[PDB]
Design goal:
Chains: A alpha+beta, B alpha/beta, C little secondary structure, D alpha/beta, E mainly beta, F alpha/beta, G little secondary structure, H mainly alpha, I alpha+beta, J mainly alpha, K alpha+beta
Subunit structure (chain H): Complex I is composed of 45 different subunits.
Number of strands of chain H: 0
Subcellular location (chain H): Mitochondrion inner membrane
Number of helices of chain C: 0
Structural class of chain C: little secondary structure
Number of strands of chain C: 0
Distance between the termini of chain H: 56 Å
Oligomer: part of a larger assembly
Order of helices and strands of chain H: H
Distance between the termini of chain C: 56 Å
Largest sheet of chain C: none
Helix content of chain C: under 10%
Shape of chain C: elongated
Structural class of chain H: mainly alpha
Cofactor (chain K): [4Fe-4S] cluster
Bound molecules: the ligand CCCCCCCCCCCCCCCCC[C@@H](O)O[C@H](CO[C@H](O)CCCCCCCCCCCCCCC)COP(=O)(O)OCC[N+](C)(C)C, NADPH dihydro-nicotinamide-adenine-dinucleotide phosphate, iron/sulfur cluster, zinc ion
Largest sheet of chain H: none
Shape of chain H: rod-shaped
Protein name (chain H): NADH dehydrogenase [ubiquinone] 1 alpha subcomplex subunit 7
Strand content of chain C: under 5%
Helix content of chain H: 10-25%
Family (chain H): Belongs to the complex I NDUFA7 subunit family.
Chain lengths: 144, 208, 38, 156, 96, 297, 29, 56, 176, 115, 379
Amino acid sequence: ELVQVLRRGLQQVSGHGGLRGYLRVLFRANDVRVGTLVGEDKYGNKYYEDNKQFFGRHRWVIYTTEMNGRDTFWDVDGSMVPPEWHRWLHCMTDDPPTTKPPTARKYIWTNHKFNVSGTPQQYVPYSTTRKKIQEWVPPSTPYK
Amino acid sequence: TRPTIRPRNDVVHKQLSAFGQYVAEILPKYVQQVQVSCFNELEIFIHPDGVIPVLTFLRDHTNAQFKSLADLTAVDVPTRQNRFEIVYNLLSLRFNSRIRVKTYTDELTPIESSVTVYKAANWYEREIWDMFGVFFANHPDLRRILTDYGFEGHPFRKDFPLSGYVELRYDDEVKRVVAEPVELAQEFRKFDLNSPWEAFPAYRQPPE
Amino acid sequence: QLIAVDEKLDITTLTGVPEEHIKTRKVRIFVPARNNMQ
Amino acid sequence: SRGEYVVAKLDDLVNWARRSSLWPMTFGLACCAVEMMHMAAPRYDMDRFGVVFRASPRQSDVMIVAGTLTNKMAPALRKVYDQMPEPRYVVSMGSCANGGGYYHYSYSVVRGCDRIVPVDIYVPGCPPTAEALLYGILQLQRKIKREKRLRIWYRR
Amino acid sequence: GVRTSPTGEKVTHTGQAYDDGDYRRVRFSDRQKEVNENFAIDLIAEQPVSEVGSRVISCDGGGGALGHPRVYINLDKETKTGTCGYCGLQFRQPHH
Amino acid sequence: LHHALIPHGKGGRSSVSGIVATVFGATGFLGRYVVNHLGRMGSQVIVPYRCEPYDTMHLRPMGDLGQIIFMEWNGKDKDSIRKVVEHSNVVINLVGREWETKNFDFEDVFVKIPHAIAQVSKEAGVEKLIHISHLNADIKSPSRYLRSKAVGEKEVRAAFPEATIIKPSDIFGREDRFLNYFASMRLGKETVKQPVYIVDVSKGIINAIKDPDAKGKTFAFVGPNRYLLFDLVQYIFAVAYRPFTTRDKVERVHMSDMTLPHLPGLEDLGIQATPLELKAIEVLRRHRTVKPAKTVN
Amino acid sequence: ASKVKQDMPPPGGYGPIDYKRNLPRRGLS
Amino acid sequence: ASATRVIQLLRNWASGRDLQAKLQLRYQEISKRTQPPPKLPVGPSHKLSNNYYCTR
Amino acid sequence: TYKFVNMREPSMDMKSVTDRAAQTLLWTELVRGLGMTLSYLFREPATINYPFEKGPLSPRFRGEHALRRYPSGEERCIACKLCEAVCPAQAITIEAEPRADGSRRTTRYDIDMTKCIYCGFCQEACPVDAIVEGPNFEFSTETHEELLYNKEKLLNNGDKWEAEIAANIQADYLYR
Amino acid sequence: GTSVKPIFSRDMNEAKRRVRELYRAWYREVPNTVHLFQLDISVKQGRDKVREMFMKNAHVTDPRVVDLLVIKGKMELEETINVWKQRTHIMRFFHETEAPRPTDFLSKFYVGHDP
Amino acid sequence: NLTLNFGPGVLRLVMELSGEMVRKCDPHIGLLHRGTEKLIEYKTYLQALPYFDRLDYVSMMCNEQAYSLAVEKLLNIQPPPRAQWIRVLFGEITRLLNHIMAVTTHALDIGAMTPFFWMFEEREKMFEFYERVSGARMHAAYIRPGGVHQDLPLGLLDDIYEFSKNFSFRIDELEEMLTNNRIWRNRTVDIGVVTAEDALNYGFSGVMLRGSGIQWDLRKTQPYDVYDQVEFDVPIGSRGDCYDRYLCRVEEMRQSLRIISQCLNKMPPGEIKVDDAKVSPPKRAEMKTSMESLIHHFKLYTEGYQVPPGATYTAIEAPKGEFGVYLVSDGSSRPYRCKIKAPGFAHLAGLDKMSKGHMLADVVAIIGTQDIVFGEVDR
Ligand SMILES: CCCCCCCCCCCCCCCCC[C@@H](O)O[C@H](CO[C@H](O)CCCCCCCCCCCCCCC)COP(=O)(O)OCC[N+](C)(C)C
Ligand SMILES: NC(=O)C1=CN([C@@H]2O[C@H](COP(=O)(O)OP(=O)(O)OC[C@H]3O[C@@H](n4cnc5c(N)ncnc54)[C@H](OP(=O)(O)O)[C@@H]3O)[C@@H](O)[C@H]2O)C=CC1
Ligand code: SF4
Ligand code: SF4
Ligand code: SF4
Ligand SMILES: [Zn+2]
């Protein structure tokens, strides 16, 4: 009844590390749910699962405070998820990379980069082919 | 004929052939040819002057009564002296059948409008005038329906370029949308996909 | 009912083609040559 | 000293107020508009971000171009853009509104809505998913957060 | 093996780099030139040459249906090593 | 001639005109027209801006993809100027403020900034430089605006010998201050004015870009006819159907327009100046809710 | 070797699917 | 769903139906996102003989 | 077979007439609609907490393009130009020439993301699984130019997403 | 022979009469259009443009082509009456924003390969 | 009697009003004309397939099915039975999406706006089914002129069954909010009445016919795939007003649920595309192991398949009415002509007749009941 839901709310506010953590999660994610921790990311992200919720809210992520070079305490975006956790988070599979990691290759990036639009690191398109027609080079010796 | 080949129906073919002969007998003044396709589709080629009579017959005869006008369109074949080909598709609900009536015309020869027979033709006729330039006489109001106001040319002709002749942009000096000669950053790549070694001997043409 | 006029056909002014694309172009009518690779 | 501090805080407050309530007006031109209506659907719920559903053009904040921009429609779209008050941002959704898309080589299609109005965010897709459009809206919010008008005026 | 242009830019694996006089370089100021650091030619040149004892060897790129179409390579020429058309791997008969 | 700038195409939006232009102060009244005229023929434009990038948005749709590059700069630093005009082969200067500021006075705006721009452009190998100053700019003028303009003109000439100095006379247009200032007051009969249309000034600048013989020349861009202040204001108020900037602007408008018949003008660039009567209605239609003024020649 | 495995309904088919309109009367004269 | 009994009775009375019988939110009854490999049987024209193309 | 949707004749006895009059005067159906709305108010909403929660997807999802490569490190693309020929929107531009070691490789591979329709024809026409349509969809841009991908950008996308791209390809390649 | 089906006019006199009526209508309508669309041009410029567009097709000697052009002009005039167009559609007749292409040989030789 | 232009899916409407009544209502179209029928001529058949998703973007797999049927008829081939059942199952699912969209949008234009969200949740679930099978939520390109592109994922039928056994309550809630409402009835009853003869002559099709009492349905009279093997009822109106057409659309939703149940129960095994490698591309393993398979894959994805010369008109019962394609082929791999007949064209043409002597607010209701999407109208 009402006392049961009040006790559940008290358990939720206690399980976030007290009042400070509860306020932090409320002001960072607008959601104070608690679930078992599936894994931790190398960039600081944490991934939680709660199978009691309906399809769509049974997996979520708490983003890192600070990524590569920017303070993401308030500025977070969905492009910060690394590819393996991106596959797990979007319900494309039931196996997190902790259970079965992706295959390792030498050419795979070791440092995921978020969207860099409106940044000095943004992509600028350019032609990749070389010059087509070569012009004649006049000689440097006078004819007379 | 294994399950990879479309099955053939002969009863419908015979019925359509018989009805084509019947129609061509009733209206020998206008019908020039009758055809039945291999997939049971009956088409009738008539003179341009018989648009109003023949259609009316197919709408009012107790044995035809093709009540519905499914589609009306034009086909451009520049190699013909009569450039444009007008196609009427009729559906008869009473007999659960479909028929096609084909007519020819050119740029300057008008075709009598069939708004009186089928009201649904109205917009369709306008569309033809918008896309091909075929003029329909005695139309309630014939004007462009699809292209922009002031558009010059009829886009659906085979000699009209794909990208048109003008393009729109916004100019701040005149503070309005202006039209300029078309210039593409990347030209449309034309592919020569057609190949030698003909595929269908059944459609081979005489070597003249 | 029939005009019976005797003059060559000319629909230049109805196609809407710009004037610079009518009197400056030079079309070619030909049977395309066989591709020598086939 | 204190003046730059005060103008910085005022600018931060104004930027937060402006980006925390974005009122969009949507040009439901073509198929992409359907996805727009799915970003107003209960699952994604554009409203909980302060982004109201189908604001009037008189008080709209951002314009969302959703679908192909034909030649017959460009004057109307340009006219609507002129009407919008104060600071207005344009978001281009889908390939058709980005660069012409599937109808790039067409006689009656404007090759990209940026020929008519300036565009702040280009959302790619055909159609972009409701998640993609929501990400574009959040990116526009971050861009608004990045701008600084009071500081520039003070340094002016 | 990413090199550097005499001006200062990085040279793409296709050898593209704007010279000193090119104005298009201005598109990179206050920005960056996107260049892939891993060069395919260098990565494939360091693969060991496989030693097989058959005249004709089959290659499908590894993975079966996830590779390239299966091809057959002849190794009669002892001067050089047979190279796969798609994958670029090398094969060689056991000389000596 | 560094092939990349060989002109190509039919002079359209997607063509190549072989012009790489850096338009300083392009976010103003004249800058928008100059950038639009440059971009409608396929030339590449580099826009150095000191303002919010939101304010420069209107310049984005006036060029094809990748033909307009926006760059941050400020007049107090030579490195920004050097990196902005590094690759350009044309440098147009439109930097100018009509009033004083606690950071930039008239001396800073009209003397030091143009001097730095000209010196850096000469050092960077720019072949064409265009600088704009007022027509009435005299070293002995009572107002500081025109004295600074005069000093600036000398500095540019000294730093860039092949510079082209253009001297317009009270440009009027859709966003100009000449007509809107007089239409917003809702004294004369001894001062004459010679207004010049904005599009004419932009086309004159563009033709100066194209003209090869206008290297070291100085131009005076003036209108077709002269107007007394009183009857010109009468016409301005009559167009708007309306019954009849701190200290420097009133003095400047109270001065009479100079006459320089030795200096070449718009006609030397093949431009027929448009009279004020044709465009006055277009400019002043927004001030609403025919007997043109008499001229002196 | 391996046997054919694709999407098929389970043996015995699926359960009944309701489609008729269900508009009840709350009940009061 | 995680709803109290009193709220459930209130909803069932107000709507007039049994909501918990047929909920509109998907739960564990859906299929898993990881599935075994398929086999996808070949078509009818995969014979090694009596399969000349001119007959089909 | 056919049904009638509006062929009900109302009863004309006293009880039914009185019931209809009571419905008209007391607004019973309006109260029923209000009760339906109230019942819908007290149930859990379907909203997910983006961007912390993401909508479900599948391995077949089409997103941002990428160019893959072999485990040895060599790019899979062989400049067969099938993807360019099959692209309905003509969004792919390919230029090639023999490499230093004689390998058949591309010198230019451009995809115009503002022309692409994300139909997936390119990834299914490729005979070596070189070009793939990745699973990323959050790649919006502030300018038009950055949506014109070249070979470097696509190779970077492949190197960036190869893990989950290969996972999806492994999961789905038996249906292709 | 060369017998053809008419459209509106049996000979050139009727086609000329229809051209005259269309010109009368356009001449009468020009000032109303100028006032209503708030154009920057004068009535003199609009009438001159109408005259130029009429004289552009002065070499047509086929009654069918002439009365088809008359039909098109009537359709465009009707389009202009009901304010179906906007200012841009009306002003597209003047090409105020397009650069003036040259005519002599030397200029065309200088600009490019266009003959 | 003043004239007014309701300017800028998006529509321009020039109408004359004599006080409150509507005298004449002329709709101006062309604001979404992109020239699909001309762009098709420059593409092969496979390349021209995706245009039909953009044609009517509320009902996409139906357009795919119509184009595939036309190309199959021209090619003289037939798909395997499993492909036909998938086509039918998906077609029914798409019909539900179209009817949900139409009814909810009509109600929102009237002003209800709650069923819009209520049923767009289910529309989102349907998008997932579209997405799981083809990787695209809306522009699927799943149905091909040889059958379907790919087989179903191993967990799709169970999810479809789970979703489709709770949809009846959603339809019941929609009817509770709309069917018996006195405001909705006053807004819809006896509005835009069209007689059977006028509906037939004006070229109407679909519900606009069935709402007037005409017993016509292309799935019953002229079945194309596996329709003659599924049993369902055809709702028929009695007055021809907006209310009758709304009831017909709801009953069509219920019958679509019935057909979906039948299709789920009677799914056959087998392949999903015609076993003719000269028309349908072979499997990837066959392409990477067999020489003929590689040659055919190359030629199909570069040049395409040649269609024998001829002209056909193929029409299906799309959710908006009779949707047809007139395809003319000259023997090459590119269609010579592709004319598209959309019911919205004829419906919007008859709008002027149907809005005679009605209030200004009635025009919105009539437009909503016409089920007008301008992508197919303008093409
Ligand atoms: C009483 C006199 C009134 C005068 C006028 C005052 C106006 C009304 C007073 C109310 C002020 C409102 C202040 C509340 C703003 C706090 C916003 C905070 O919650 O946001 C964070 C802080 O944002 C900014 O960093 C701080 C901006 C707040 C302004 C700083 C103090 C300025 C006060 C100066 C007022 C003096 C006015 C003097 C002239 C009237 C970051 O959140 P954000 O990134 O957005 O969104 C994250 C999205 N997630 C959750 C999904 C991840
Ligand atoms: N009446 C007229 O307009 C005629 C113009 N004059 C001359 O023509 C030139 C341009 O005229 P106009 O465009 O109308 O003037 P504007 O005031 O409209 O534009 C001034 C431009 O210069 C920039 N600018 C101004 N001050 C500074 C500064 N201290 N540092 C950096 N940039 C600055 C502005 O950028 P921002 O907005 O970001 O500050 C702006 O881009 C000027 O040199 C003027 O003197 C010649 C005769 C008269
Ligand atoms: S093709 Fe793409 S952008 Fe165009 S309407 Fe369809 S989904 Fe929208
Ligand atoms: S997805 Fe389709 S449109 Fe996009 S690049 Fe590939 S083939 Fe071309
Ligand atoms: S189909 Fe594949 S291998 Fe061929 S050019 Fe395209 S990406 Fe390269
Ligand atoms: Zn290999």
